Amino acid sequence: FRHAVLLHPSPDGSHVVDAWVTWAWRERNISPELDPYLIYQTSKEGRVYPRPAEAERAIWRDLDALLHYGNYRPTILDNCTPLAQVPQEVLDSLRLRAFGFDQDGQARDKQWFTATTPAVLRWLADRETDDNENARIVRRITLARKAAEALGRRLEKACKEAWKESNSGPWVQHGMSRYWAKAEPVFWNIVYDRPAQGYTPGMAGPGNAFNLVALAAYDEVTGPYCERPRVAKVVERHRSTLFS
DNA sequence: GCCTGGCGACAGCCCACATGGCATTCCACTTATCACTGGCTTCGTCCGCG
């Protein structure tokens, strides 16, 4: 470990009284091979780093554990969860859990959250017990998740690009907060097939349901600043990208 | 006491429009400007003040 701890005991051993947190190494070493658990990302210059936790995705409880219904995927999951592996039925009832600690890479810290996948999503598939309405449920759910995330990144980059341009960002924080808060019930309406705006029950896919929520959150955030024509032109150039 | 009815006489009828018209040119700007600050850690050293 990069950190070295020593805990001074209480005489009974019931508690710790003092603690020493200090370095064990002066020279850092590259740890060989990427960590299976984390989700990685490559960025211009080609450097590979783990995707940071975001407390905005924790606003919608348990969104990361929906990772199973899926581009880039953690290797441990991609070895043990799929069908090349070896178990027979086990894979049907496995369910994913994630521990995320969103914080600064320095000493500031913001939020942590656990996230087990809901057992309702797979159990709603077995209530029926048919090959087709079930594969269609699973297809819908996987489809819903894909739409919500693609427009989550589209909306992050939208707000981020617009904020930088408008001043020649704080818009991203409220953008994502509003996004997942509004995008959470529309997802659960798409799964149950209940009627959600931007969606028609029984449609083959998400149906633009998600693209509408992103536009409403974005327009909710950039709303007071689309007044001046110069800034309004920038904001419009970047909301247009969320039109899909 | 409450409810209802009454208080000269006070006019009637007929009549009501057709037709026509309703504009057109031109002209619509430039320039300059567009903030800062911070909300990490512990410790050590230096400088200032008493």
Side-chain angles (χ1 to χ4, degrees), chain A residues 66 68-70 73 121 135-141 143-149 187 190-191 204-206 210:
Chain A
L66 295 194
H68 234 334
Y69 290 95
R73 296 175 190 183
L121 290 199
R136 288 184 62 180
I137 287 184
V138 164
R139 209 36 202 288
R140 307 240 307 280
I141 294 192
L143 283 240
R145 165 199 204 270
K146 290 225 121 105
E149 302 215 316
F187 175 85
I190 289 181
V191 63
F210 292 106

mmCIF file with all atom_site columns, all heavy atoms in Angstrom, chain A residues 66 68-70 73 121 135-149 187 190-191 204-206 210, unseen atoms left out:
data_model
loop_
_atom_site.group_PDB
_atom_site.id
_atom_site.type_symbol
_atom_site.label_atom_id
_atom_site.label_alt_id
_atom_site.label_comp_id
_atom_site.label_asym_id
_atom_site.label_entity_id
_atom_site.label_seq_id
_atom_site.pdbx_PDB_ins_code
_atom_site.Cartn_x
_atom_site.Cartn_y
_atom_site.Cartn_z
_atom_site.occupancy
_atom_site.B_iso_or_equiv
_atom_site.pdbx_formal_charge
_atom_site.auth_seq_id
_atom_site.auth_comp_id
_atom_site.auth_asym_id
_atom_site.auth_atom_id
_atom_site.pdbx_PDB_model_num
ATOM 1   N N   . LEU A 1 66  ? -26.721 -1.518  -13.008 1.00 0.00 ? 66  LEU A N   1
ATOM 2   C CA  . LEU A 1 66  ? -27.424 -1.870  -14.227 1.00 0.00 ? 66  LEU A CA  1
ATOM 3   C C   . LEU A 1 66  ? -26.391 -2.101  -15.343 1.00 0.00 ? 66  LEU A C   1
ATOM 4   O O   . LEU A 1 66  ? -26.729 -2.239  -16.511 1.00 0.00 ? 66  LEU A O   1
ATOM 5   C CB  . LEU A 1 66  ? -28.409 -0.774  -14.612 1.00 0.00 ? 66  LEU A CB  1
ATOM 6   C CG  . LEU A 1 66  ? -29.545 -0.593  -13.614 1.00 0.00 ? 66  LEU A CG  1
ATOM 7   C CD1 . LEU A 1 66  ? -30.651 0.249   -14.215 1.00 0.00 ? 66  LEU A CD1 1
ATOM 8   C CD2 . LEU A 1 66  ? -30.079 -1.945  -13.182 1.00 0.00 ? 66  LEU A CD2 1
ATOM 9   N N   . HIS A 1 68  ? -24.653 -4.633  -15.868 1.00 0.00 ? 68  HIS A N   1
ATOM 10  C CA  . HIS A 1 68  ? -24.809 -5.969  -16.425 1.00 0.00 ? 68  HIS A CA  1
ATOM 11  C C   . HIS A 1 68  ? -25.655 -6.000  -17.699 1.00 0.00 ? 68  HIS A C   1
ATOM 12  O O   . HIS A 1 68  ? -25.402 -6.809  -18.586 1.00 0.00 ? 68  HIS A O   1
ATOM 13  C CB  . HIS A 1 68  ? -25.402 -6.928  -15.386 1.00 0.00 ? 68  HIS A CB  1
ATOM 14  C CG  . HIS A 1 68  ? -24.589 -8.169  -15.173 1.00 0.00 ? 68  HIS A CG  1
ATOM 15  N ND1 . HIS A 1 68  ? -23.758 -8.690  -16.142 1.00 0.00 ? 68  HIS A ND1 1
ATOM 16  C CD2 . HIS A 1 68  ? -24.473 -8.985  -14.101 1.00 0.00 ? 68  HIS A CD2 1
ATOM 17  C CE1 . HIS A 1 68  ? -23.164 -9.774  -15.675 1.00 0.00 ? 68  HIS A CE1 1
ATOM 18  N NE2 . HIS A 1 68  ? -23.580 -9.975  -14.438 1.00 0.00 ? 68  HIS A NE2 1
ATOM 19  N N   . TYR A 1 69  ? -26.671 -5.152  -17.783 1.00 0.00 ? 69  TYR A N   1
ATOM 20  C CA  . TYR A 1 69  ? -27.545 -5.177  -18.946 1.00 0.00 ? 69  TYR A CA  1
ATOM 21  C C   . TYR A 1 69  ? -26.923 -4.593  -20.209 1.00 0.00 ? 69  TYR A C   1
ATOM 22  O O   . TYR A 1 69  ? -27.616 -4.474  -21.222 1.00 0.00 ? 69  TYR A O   1
ATOM 23  C CB  . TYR A 1 69  ? -28.842 -4.482  -18.561 1.00 0.00 ? 69  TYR A CB  1
ATOM 24  C CG  . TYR A 1 69  ? -29.604 -5.345  -17.594 1.00 0.00 ? 69  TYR A CG  1
ATOM 25  C CD1 . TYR A 1 69  ? -29.492 -5.147  -16.227 1.00 0.00 ? 69  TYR A CD1 1
ATOM 26  C CD2 . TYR A 1 69  ? -30.375 -6.402  -18.036 1.00 0.00 ? 69  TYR A CD2 1
ATOM 27  C CE1 . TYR A 1 69  ? -30.160 -5.946  -15.330 1.00 0.00 ? 69  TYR A CE1 1
ATOM 28  C CE2 . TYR A 1 69  ? -31.046 -7.208  -17.145 1.00 0.00 ? 69  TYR A CE2 1
ATOM 29  C CZ  . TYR A 1 69  ? -30.933 -6.976  -15.793 1.00 0.00 ? 69  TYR A CZ  1
ATOM 30  O OH  . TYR A 1 69  ? -31.599 -7.778  -14.901 1.00 0.00 ? 69  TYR A OH  1
ATOM 31  N N   . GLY A 1 70  ? -25.658 -4.208  -20.188 1.00 0.00 ? 70  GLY A N   1
ATOM 32  C CA  . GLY A 1 70  ? -25.041 -3.680  -21.386 1.00 0.00 ? 70  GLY A CA  1
ATOM 33  C C   . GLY A 1 70  ? -24.785 -4.730  -22.438 1.00 0.00 ? 70  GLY A C   1
ATOM 34  O O   . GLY A 1 70  ? -24.419 -4.400  -23.566 1.00 0.00 ? 70  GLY A O   1
ATOM 35  N N   . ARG A 1 73  ? -16.157 -2.443  -20.722 1.00 0.00 ? 73  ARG A N   1
ATOM 36  C CA  . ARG A 1 73  ? -16.757 -3.169  -19.604 1.00 0.00 ? 73  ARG A CA  1
ATOM 37  C C   . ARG A 1 73  ? -15.634 -3.709  -18.730 1.00 0.00 ? 73  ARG A C   1
ATOM 38  O O   . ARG A 1 73  ? -14.586 -4.096  -19.258 1.00 0.00 ? 73  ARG A O   1
ATOM 39  C CB  . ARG A 1 73  ? -17.630 -4.334  -20.079 1.00 0.00 ? 73  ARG A CB  1
ATOM 40  C CG  . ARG A 1 73  ? -18.846 -3.925  -20.886 1.00 0.00 ? 73  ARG A CG  1
ATOM 41  C CD  . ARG A 1 73  ? -19.569 -5.139  -21.413 1.00 0.00 ? 73  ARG A CD  1
ATOM 42  N NE  . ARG A 1 73  ? -20.606 -4.793  -22.376 1.00 0.00 ? 73  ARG A NE  1
ATOM 43  C CZ  . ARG A 1 73  ? -21.416 -5.680  -22.934 1.00 0.00 ? 73  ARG A CZ  1
ATOM 44  N NH1 . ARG A 1 73  ? -21.315 -6.961  -22.615 1.00 0.00 ? 73  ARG A NH1 1
ATOM 45  N NH2 . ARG A 1 73  ? -22.319 -5.291  -23.817 1.00 0.00 ? 73  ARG A NH2 1
ATOM 46  N N   . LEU A 1 121 ? -35.989 -6.075  -11.689 1.00 0.00 ? 121 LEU A N   1
ATOM 47  C CA  . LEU A 1 121 ? -35.915 -6.021  -13.146 1.00 0.00 ? 121 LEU A CA  1
ATOM 48  C C   . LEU A 1 121 ? -35.846 -7.406  -13.758 1.00 0.00 ? 121 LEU A C   1
ATOM 49  O O   . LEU A 1 121 ? -36.508 -7.671  -14.769 1.00 0.00 ? 121 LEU A O   1
ATOM 50  C CB  . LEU A 1 121 ? -34.687 -5.244  -13.599 1.00 0.00 ? 121 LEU A CB  1
ATOM 51  C CG  . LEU A 1 121 ? -34.590 -3.749  -13.403 1.00 0.00 ? 121 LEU A CG  1
ATOM 52  C CD1 . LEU A 1 121 ? -33.545 -3.206  -14.337 1.00 0.00 ? 121 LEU A CD1 1
ATOM 53  C CD2 . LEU A 1 121 ? -35.901 -3.102  -13.620 1.00 0.00 ? 121 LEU A CD2 1
ATOM 54  N N   . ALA A 1 135 ? -37.903 -11.809 -23.614 1.00 0.00 ? 135 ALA A N   1
ATOM 55  C CA  . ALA A 1 135 ? -36.718 -11.289 -24.294 1.00 0.00 ? 135 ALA A CA  1
ATOM 56  C C   . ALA A 1 135 ? -36.944 -9.857  -24.720 1.00 0.00 ? 135 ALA A C   1
ATOM 57  O O   . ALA A 1 135 ? -35.985 -9.097  -24.906 1.00 0.00 ? 135 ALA A O   1
ATOM 58  C CB  . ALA A 1 135 ? -36.361 -12.164 -25.493 1.00 0.00 ? 135 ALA A CB  1
ATOM 59  N N   . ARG A 1 136 ? -38.206 -9.497  -24.872 1.00 0.00 ? 136 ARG A N   1
ATOM 60  C CA  . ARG A 1 136 ? -38.639 -8.163  -25.224 1.00 0.00 ? 136 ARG A CA  1
ATOM 61  C C   . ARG A 1 136 ? -38.550 -7.240  -24.013 1.00 0.00 ? 136 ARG A C   1
ATOM 62  O O   . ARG A 1 136 ? -38.171 -6.074  -24.149 1.00 0.00 ? 136 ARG A O   1
ATOM 63  C CB  . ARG A 1 136 ? -40.070 -8.273  -25.740 1.00 0.00 ? 136 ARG A CB  1
ATOM 64  C CG  . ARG A 1 136 ? -40.182 -8.910  -27.124 1.00 0.00 ? 136 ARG A CG  1
ATOM 65  C CD  . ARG A 1 136 ? -41.623 -8.897  -27.604 1.00 0.00 ? 136 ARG A CD  1
ATOM 66  N NE  . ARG A 1 136 ? -42.240 -7.595  -27.784 1.00 0.00 ? 136 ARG A NE  1
ATOM 67  C CZ  . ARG A 1 136 ? -43.489 -7.452  -28.204 1.00 0.00 ? 136 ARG A CZ  1
ATOM 68  N NH1 . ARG A 1 136 ? -44.219 -8.529  -28.469 1.00 0.00 ? 136 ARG A NH1 1
ATOM 69  N NH2 . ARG A 1 136 ? -44.011 -6.247  -28.354 1.00 0.00 ? 136 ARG A NH2 1
ATOM 70  N N   . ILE A 1 137 ? -38.897 -7.744  -22.824 1.00 0.00 ? 137 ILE A N   1
ATOM 71  C CA  . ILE A 1 137 ? -38.680 -6.995  -21.586 1.00 0.00 ? 137 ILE A CA  1
ATOM 72  C C   . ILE A 1 137 ? -37.203 -6.720  -21.369 1.00 0.00 ? 137 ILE A C   1
ATOM 73  O O   . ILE A 1 137 ? -36.793 -5.586  -21.086 1.00 0.00 ? 137 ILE A O   1
ATOM 74  C CB  . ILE A 1 137 ? -39.277 -7.760  -20.394 1.00 0.00 ? 137 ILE A CB  1
ATOM 75  C CG1 . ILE A 1 137 ? -40.797 -7.674  -20.433 1.00 0.00 ? 137 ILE A CG1 1
ATOM 76  C CG2 . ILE A 1 137 ? -38.683 -7.271  -19.090 1.00 0.00 ? 137 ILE A CG2 1
ATOM 77  C CD1 . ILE A 1 137 ? -41.473 -8.321  -19.261 1.00 0.00 ? 137 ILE A CD1 1
ATOM 78  N N   . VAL A 1 138 ? -36.394 -7.762  -21.486 1.00 0.00 ? 138 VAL A N   1
ATOM 79  C CA  . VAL A 1 138 ? -34.966 -7.613  -21.296 1.00 0.00 ? 138 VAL A CA  1
ATOM 80  C C   . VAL A 1 138 ? -34.429 -6.674  -22.358 1.00 0.00 ? 138 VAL A C   1
ATOM 81  O O   . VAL A 1 138 ? -33.602 -5.822  -22.076 1.00 0.00 ? 138 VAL A O   1
ATOM 82  C CB  . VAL A 1 138 ? -34.254 -8.977  -21.346 1.00 0.00 ? 138 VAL A CB  1
ATOM 83  C CG1 . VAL A 1 138 ? -32.754 -8.825  -21.548 1.00 0.00 ? 138 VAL A CG1 1
ATOM 84  C CG2 . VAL A 1 138 ? -34.534 -9.747  -20.069 1.00 0.00 ? 138 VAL A CG2 1
ATOM 85  N N   . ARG A 1 139 ? -34.905 -6.822  -23.582 1.00 0.00 ? 139 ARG A N   1
ATOM 86  C CA  . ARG A 1 139 ? -34.433 -5.961  -24.644 1.00 0.00 ? 139 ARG A CA  1
ATOM 87  C C   . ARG A 1 139 ? -34.801 -4.523  -24.342 1.00 0.00 ? 139 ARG A C   1
ATOM 88  O O   . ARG A 1 139 ? -34.005 -3.616  -24.550 1.00 0.00 ? 139 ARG A O   1
ATOM 89  C CB  . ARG A 1 139 ? -35.013 -6.382  -25.990 1.00 0.00 ? 139 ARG A CB  1
ATOM 90  C CG  . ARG A 1 139 ? -34.119 -6.063  -27.181 1.00 0.00 ? 139 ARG A CG  1
ATOM 91  C CD  . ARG A 1 139 ? -32.644 -6.239  -26.849 1.00 0.00 ? 139 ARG A CD  1
ATOM 92  N NE  . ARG A 1 139 ? -31.792 -5.478  -27.753 1.00 0.00 ? 139 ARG A NE  1
ATOM 93  C CZ  . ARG A 1 139 ? -31.581 -5.799  -29.027 1.00 0.00 ? 139 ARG A CZ  1
ATOM 94  N NH1 . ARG A 1 139 ? -32.164 -6.874  -29.544 1.00 0.00 ? 139 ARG A NH1 1
ATOM 95  N NH2 . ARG A 1 139 ? -30.786 -5.051  -29.786 1.00 0.00 ? 139 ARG A NH2 1
ATOM 96  N N   . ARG A 1 140 ? -36.013 -4.315  -23.846 1.00 0.00 ? 140 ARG A N   1
ATOM 97  C CA  . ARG A 1 140 ? -36.467 -2.971  -23.519 1.00 0.00 ? 140 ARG A CA  1
ATOM 98  C C   . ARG A 1 140 ? -35.600 -2.348  -22.448 1.00 0.00 ? 140 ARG A C   1
ATOM 99  O O   . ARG A 1 140 ? -35.125 -1.229  -22.586 1.00 0.00 ? 140 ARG A O   1
ATOM 100 C CB  . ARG A 1 140 ? -37.914 -2.991  -23.028 1.00 0.00 ? 140 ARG A CB  1
ATOM 101 C CG  . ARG A 1 140 ? -38.881 -3.692  -23.963 1.00 0.00 ? 140 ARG A CG  1
ATOM 102 C CD  . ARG A 1 140 ? -39.979 -2.751  -24.429 1.00 0.00 ? 140 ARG A CD  1
ATOM 103 N NE  . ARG A 1 140 ? -40.642 -2.105  -23.303 1.00 0.00 ? 140 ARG A NE  1
ATOM 104 C CZ  . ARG A 1 140 ? -41.586 -2.677  -22.567 1.00 0.00 ? 140 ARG A CZ  1
ATOM 105 N NH1 . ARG A 1 140 ? -41.982 -3.910  -22.836 1.00 0.00 ? 140 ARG A NH1 1
ATOM 106 N NH2 . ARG A 1 140 ? -42.132 -2.013  -21.560 1.00 0.00 ? 140 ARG A NH2 1
ATOM 107 N N   . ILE A 1 141 ? -35.397 -3.091  -21.372 1.00 0.00 ? 141 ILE A N   1
ATOM 108 C CA  . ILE A 1 141 ? -34.622 -2.613  -20.237 1.00 0.00 ? 141 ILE A CA  1
ATOM 109 C C   . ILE A 1 141 ? -33.193 -2.305  -20.650 1.00 0.00 ? 141 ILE A C   1
ATOM 110 O O   . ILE A 1 141 ? -32.647 -1.289  -20.250 1.00 0.00 ? 141 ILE A O   1
ATOM 111 C CB  . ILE A 1 141 ? -34.619 -3.616  -19.068 1.00 0.00 ? 141 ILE A CB  1
ATOM 112 C CG1 . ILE A 1 141 ? -36.019 -3.753  -18.479 1.00 0.00 ? 141 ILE A CG1 1
ATOM 113 C CG2 . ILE A 1 141 ? -33.670 -3.161  -17.976 1.00 0.00 ? 141 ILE A CG2 1
ATOM 114 C CD1 . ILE A 1 141 ? -36.056 -4.498  -17.163 1.00 0.00 ? 141 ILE A CD1 1
ATOM 115 N N   . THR A 1 142 ? -32.578 -3.171  -21.443 1.00 0.00 ? 142 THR A N   1
ATOM 116 C CA  . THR A 1 142 ? -31.218 -2.907  -21.878 1.00 0.00 ? 142 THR A CA  1
ATOM 117 C C   . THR A 1 142 ? -31.244 -1.672  -22.734 1.00 0.00 ? 142 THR A C   1
ATOM 118 O O   . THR A 1 142 ? -30.361 -0.832  -22.666 1.00 0.00 ? 142 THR A O   1
ATOM 119 C CB  . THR A 1 142 ? -30.622 -4.044  -22.700 1.00 0.00 ? 142 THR A CB  1
ATOM 120 N N   . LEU A 1 143 ? -32.267 -1.573  -23.564 1.00 0.00 ? 143 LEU A N   1
ATOM 121 C CA  . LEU A 1 143 ? -32.407 -0.430  -24.437 1.00 0.00 ? 143 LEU A CA  1
ATOM 122 C C   . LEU A 1 143 ? -32.612 0.851   -23.651 1.00 0.00 ? 143 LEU A C   1
ATOM 123 O O   . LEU A 1 143 ? -32.056 1.888   -23.996 1.00 0.00 ? 143 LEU A O   1
ATOM 124 C CB  . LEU A 1 143 ? -33.558 -0.644  -25.417 1.00 0.00 ? 143 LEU A CB  1
ATOM 125 C CG  . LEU A 1 143 ? -33.329 -1.570  -26.611 1.00 0.00 ? 143 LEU A CG  1
ATOM 126 C CD1 . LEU A 1 143 ? -33.521 -0.809  -27.909 1.00 0.00 ? 143 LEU A CD1 1
ATOM 127 C CD2 . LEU A 1 143 ? -31.966 -2.242  -26.590 1.00 0.00 ? 143 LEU A CD2 1
ATOM 128 N N   . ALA A 1 144 ? -33.416 0.789   -22.597 1.00 0.00 ? 144 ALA A N   1
ATOM 129 C CA  . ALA A 1 144 ? -33.682 1.979   -21.810 1.00 0.00 ? 144 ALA A CA  1
ATOM 130 C C   . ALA A 1 144 ? -32.419 2.505   -21.173 1.00 0.00 ? 144 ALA A C   1
ATOM 131 O O   . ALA A 1 144 ? -32.155 3.698   -21.199 1.00 0.00 ? 144 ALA A O   1
ATOM 132 C CB  . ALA A 1 144 ? -34.717 1.685   -20.743 1.00 0.00 ? 144 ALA A CB  1
ATOM 133 N N   . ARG A 1 145 ? -31.633 1.591   -20.613 1.00 0.00 ? 145 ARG A N   1
ATOM 134 C CA  . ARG A 1 145 ? -30.378 1.942   -19.965 1.00 0.00 ? 145 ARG A CA  1
ATOM 135 C C   . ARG A 1 145 ? -29.395 2.578   -20.943 1.00 0.00 ? 145 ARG A C   1
ATOM 136 O O   . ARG A 1 145 ? -28.698 3.531   -20.595 1.00 0.00 ? 145 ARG A O   1
ATOM 137 C CB  . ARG A 1 145 ? -29.749 0.707   -19.317 1.00 0.00 ? 145 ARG A CB  1
ATOM 138 C CG  . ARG A 1 145 ? -28.291 0.889   -18.922 1.00 0.00 ? 145 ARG A CG  1
ATOM 139 C CD  . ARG A 1 145 ? -27.598 -0.452  -18.738 1.00 0.00 ? 145 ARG A CD  1
ATOM 140 N NE  . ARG A 1 145 ? -26.443 -0.354  -17.851 1.00 0.00 ? 145 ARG A NE  1
ATOM 141 C CZ  . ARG A 1 145 ? -25.207 -0.083  -18.260 1.00 0.00 ? 145 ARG A CZ  1
ATOM 142 N NH1 . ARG A 1 145 ? -24.961 0.116   -19.548 1.00 0.00 ? 145 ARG A NH1 1
ATOM 143 N NH2 . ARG A 1 145 ? -24.216 -0.014  -17.382 1.00 0.00 ? 145 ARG A NH2 1
ATOM 144 N N   . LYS A 1 146 ? -29.334 2.054   -22.165 1.00 0.00 ? 146 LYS A N   1
ATOM 145 C CA  . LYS A 1 146 ? -28.422 2.599   -23.153 1.00 0.00 ? 146 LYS A CA  1
ATOM 146 C C   . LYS A 1 146 ? -28.777 4.035   -23.532 1.00 0.00 ? 146 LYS A C   1
ATOM 147 O O   . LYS A 1 146 ? -27.895 4.873   -23.665 1.00 0.00 ? 146 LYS A O   1
ATOM 148 C CB  . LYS A 1 146 ? -28.373 1.704   -24.377 1.00 0.00 ? 146 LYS A CB  1
ATOM 149 C CG  . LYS A 1 146 ? -27.672 0.387   -24.115 1.00 0.00 ? 146 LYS A CG  1
ATOM 150 C CD  . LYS A 1 146 ? -26.714 0.045   -25.237 1.00 0.00 ? 146 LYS A CD  1
ATOM 151 C CE  . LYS A 1 146 ? -25.299 -0.117  -24.720 1.00 0.00 ? 146 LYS A CE  1
ATOM 152 N NZ  . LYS A 1 146 ? -24.899 -1.549  -24.660 1.00 0.00 ? 146 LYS A NZ  1
ATOM 153 N N   . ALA A 1 147 ? -30.065 4.319   -23.699 1.00 0.00 ? 147 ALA A N   1
ATOM 154 C CA  . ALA A 1 147 ? -30.528 5.657   -24.027 1.00 0.00 ? 147 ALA A CA  1
ATOM 155 C C   . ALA A 1 147 ? -30.232 6.624   -22.890 1.00 0.00 ? 147 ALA A C   1
ATOM 156 O O   . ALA A 1 147 ? -29.653 7.697   -23.106 1.00 0.00 ? 147 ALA A O   1
ATOM 157 C CB  . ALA A 1 147 ? -32.017 5.641   -24.339 1.00 0.00 ? 147 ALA A CB  1
ATOM 158 N N   . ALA A 1 148 ? -30.516 6.214   -21.654 1.00 0.00 ? 148 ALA A N   1
ATOM 159 C CA  . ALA A 1 148 ? -30.283 7.115   -20.535 1.00 0.00 ? 148 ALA A CA  1
ATOM 160 C C   . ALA A 1 148 ? -28.818 7.497   -20.405 1.00 0.00 ? 148 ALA A C   1
ATOM 161 O O   . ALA A 1 148 ? -28.497 8.657   -20.134 1.00 0.00 ? 148 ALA A O   1
ATOM 162 C CB  . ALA A 1 148 ? -30.780 6.478   -19.244 1.00 0.00 ? 148 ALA A CB  1
ATOM 163 N N   . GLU A 1 149 ? -27.912 6.551   -20.627 1.00 0.00 ? 149 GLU A N   1
ATOM 164 C CA  . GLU A 1 149 ? -26.502 6.867   -20.455 1.00 0.00 ? 149 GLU A CA  1
ATOM 165 C C   . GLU A 1 149 ? -25.963 7.670   -21.636 1.00 0.00 ? 149 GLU A C   1
ATOM 166 O O   . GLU A 1 149 ? -25.214 8.630   -21.445 1.00 0.00 ? 149 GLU A O   1
ATOM 167 C CB  . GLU A 1 149 ? -25.688 5.623   -20.250 1.00 0.00 ? 149 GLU A CB  1
ATOM 168 C CG  . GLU A 1 149 ? -26.115 4.784   -19.066 1.00 0.00 ? 149 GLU A CG  1
ATOM 169 C CD  . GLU A 1 149 ? -24.916 4.161   -18.423 1.00 0.00 ? 149 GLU A CD  1
ATOM 170 O OE1 . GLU A 1 149 ? -24.074 3.660   -19.205 1.00 0.00 ? 149 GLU A OE1 1
ATOM 171 O OE2 . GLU A 1 149 ? -25.010 3.783   -17.231 1.00 0.00 ? 149 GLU A OE2 1
ATOM 172 N N   . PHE A 1 187 ? -37.472 6.134   -16.790 1.00 0.00 ? 187 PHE A N   1
ATOM 173 C CA  . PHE A 1 187 ? -36.959 4.779   -16.965 1.00 0.00 ? 187 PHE A CA  1
ATOM 174 C C   . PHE A 1 187 ? -37.931 3.781   -16.354 1.00 0.00 ? 187 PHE A C   1
ATOM 175 O O   . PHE A 1 187 ? -38.372 2.841   -17.022 1.00 0.00 ? 187 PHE A O   1
ATOM 176 C CB  . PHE A 1 187 ? -35.565 4.642   -16.369 1.00 0.00 ? 187 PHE A CB  1
ATOM 177 C CG  . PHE A 1 187 ? -35.029 3.246   -16.405 1.00 0.00 ? 187 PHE A CG  1
ATOM 178 C CD1 . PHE A 1 187 ? -34.396 2.780   -17.540 1.00 0.00 ? 187 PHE A CD1 1
ATOM 179 C CD2 . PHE A 1 187 ? -35.141 2.406   -15.321 1.00 0.00 ? 187 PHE A CD2 1
ATOM 180 C CE1 . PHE A 1 187 ? -33.896 1.514   -17.591 1.00 0.00 ? 187 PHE A CE1 1
ATOM 181 C CE2 . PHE A 1 187 ? -34.638 1.134   -15.371 1.00 0.00 ? 187 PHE A CE2 1
ATOM 182 C CZ  . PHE A 1 187 ? -34.018 0.689   -16.507 1.00 0.00 ? 187 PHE A CZ  1
ATOM 183 N N   . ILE A 1 190 ? -40.748 3.264   -18.525 1.00 0.00 ? 190 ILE A N   1
ATOM 184 C CA  . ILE A 1 190 ? -40.472 2.511   -19.738 1.00 0.00 ? 190 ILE A CA  1
ATOM 185 C C   . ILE A 1 190 ? -40.379 1.032   -19.437 1.00 0.00 ? 190 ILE A C   1
ATOM 186 O O   . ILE A 1 190 ? -40.784 0.199   -20.254 1.00 0.00 ? 190 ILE A O   1
ATOM 187 C CB  . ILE A 1 190 ? -39.189 3.020   -20.428 1.00 0.00 ? 190 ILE A CB  1
ATOM 188 C CG1 . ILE A 1 190 ? -39.405 4.400   -21.047 1.00 0.00 ? 190 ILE A CG1 1
ATOM 189 C CG2 . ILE A 1 190 ? -38.691 2.027   -21.444 1.00 0.00 ? 190 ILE A CG2 1
ATOM 190 C CD1 . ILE A 1 190 ? -38.183 4.944   -21.771 1.00 0.00 ? 190 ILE A CD1 1
ATOM 191 N N   . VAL A 1 191 ? -39.883 0.664   -18.263 1.00 0.00 ? 191 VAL A N   1
ATOM 192 C CA  . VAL A 1 191 ? -39.781 -0.758  -17.972 1.00 0.00 ? 191 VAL A CA  1
ATOM 193 C C   . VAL A 1 191 ? -41.166 -1.356  -17.756 1.00 0.00 ? 191 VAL A C   1
ATOM 194 O O   . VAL A 1 191 ? -41.438 -2.481  -18.183 1.00 0.00 ? 191 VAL A O   1
ATOM 195 C CB  . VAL A 1 191 ? -38.837 -1.005  -16.783 1.00 0.00 ? 191 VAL A CB  1
ATOM 196 C CG1 . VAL A 1 191 ? -39.353 -0.375  -15.526 1.00 0.00 ? 191 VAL A CG1 1
ATOM 197 C CG2 . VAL A 1 191 ? -38.660 -2.471  -16.578 1.00 0.00 ? 191 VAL A CG2 1
ATOM 198 N N   . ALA A 1 204 ? -40.827 -0.637  -29.680 1.00 0.00 ? 204 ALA A N   1
ATOM 199 C CA  . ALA A 1 204 ? -39.684 -1.547  -29.668 1.00 0.00 ? 204 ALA A CA  1
ATOM 200 C C   . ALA A 1 204 ? -38.534 -1.054  -28.792 1.00 0.00 ? 204 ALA A C   1
ATOM 201 O O   . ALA A 1 204 ? -37.794 -1.874  -28.238 1.00 0.00 ? 204 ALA A O   1
ATOM 202 C CB  . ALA A 1 204 ? -39.183 -1.777  -31.089 1.00 0.00 ? 204 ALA A CB  1
ATOM 203 N N   . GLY A 1 205 ? -38.361 0.256   -28.641 1.00 0.00 ? 205 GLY A N   1
ATOM 204 C CA  . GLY A 1 205 ? -37.251 0.769   -27.872 1.00 0.00 ? 205 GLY A CA  1
ATOM 205 C C   . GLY A 1 205 ? -37.604 1.891   -26.917 1.00 0.00 ? 205 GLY A C   1
ATOM 206 O O   . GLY A 1 205 ? -38.766 2.091   -26.562 1.00 0.00 ? 205 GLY A O   1
ATOM 207 N N   . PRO A 1 206 ? -36.595 2.645   -26.475 1.00 0.00 ? 206 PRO A N   1
ATOM 208 C CA  . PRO A 1 206 ? -36.875 3.747   -25.547 1.00 0.00 ? 206 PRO A CA  1
ATOM 209 C C   . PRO A 1 206 ? -37.768 4.814   -26.142 1.00 0.00 ? 206 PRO A C   1
ATOM 210 O O   . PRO A 1 206 ? -38.513 5.460   -25.399 1.00 0.00 ? 206 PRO A O   1
ATOM 211 C CB  . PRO A 1 206 ? -35.477 4.290   -25.224 1.00 0.00 ? 206 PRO A CB  1
ATOM 212 C CG  . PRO A 1 206 ? -34.542 3.163   -25.557 1.00 0.00 ? 206 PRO A CG  1
ATOM 213 C CD  . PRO A 1 206 ? -35.157 2.474   -26.718 1.00 0.00 ? 206 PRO A CD  1
ATOM 214 N N   . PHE A 1 210 ? -36.014 9.379   -23.267 1.00 0.00 ? 210 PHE A N   1
ATOM 215 C CA  . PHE A 1 210 ? -34.830 9.935   -22.630 1.00 0.00 ? 210 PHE A CA  1
ATOM 216 C C   . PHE A 1 210 ? -34.323 11.253  -23.192 1.00 0.00 ? 210 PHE A C   1
ATOM 217 O O   . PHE A 1 210 ? -33.886 12.118  -22.446 1.00 0.00 ? 210 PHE A O   1
ATOM 218 C CB  . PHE A 1 210 ? -33.748 8.877   -22.518 1.00 0.00 ? 210 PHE A CB  1
ATOM 219 C CG  . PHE A 1 210 ? -34.114 7.788   -21.566 1.00 0.00 ? 210 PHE A CG  1
ATOM 220 C CD1 . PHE A 1 210 ? -34.476 6.546   -22.026 1.00 0.00 ? 210 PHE A CD1 1
ATOM 221 C CD2 . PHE A 1 210 ? -34.155 8.034   -20.214 1.00 0.00 ? 210 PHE A CD2 1
ATOM 222 C CE1 . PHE A 1 210 ? -34.838 5.553   -21.150 1.00 0.00 ? 210 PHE A CE1 1
ATOM 223 C CE2 . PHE A 1 210 ? -34.517 7.049   -19.333 1.00 0.00 ? 210 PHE A CE2 1
ATOM 224 C CZ  . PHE A 1 210 ? -34.858 5.806   -19.802 1.00 0.00 ? 210 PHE A CZ  1
#
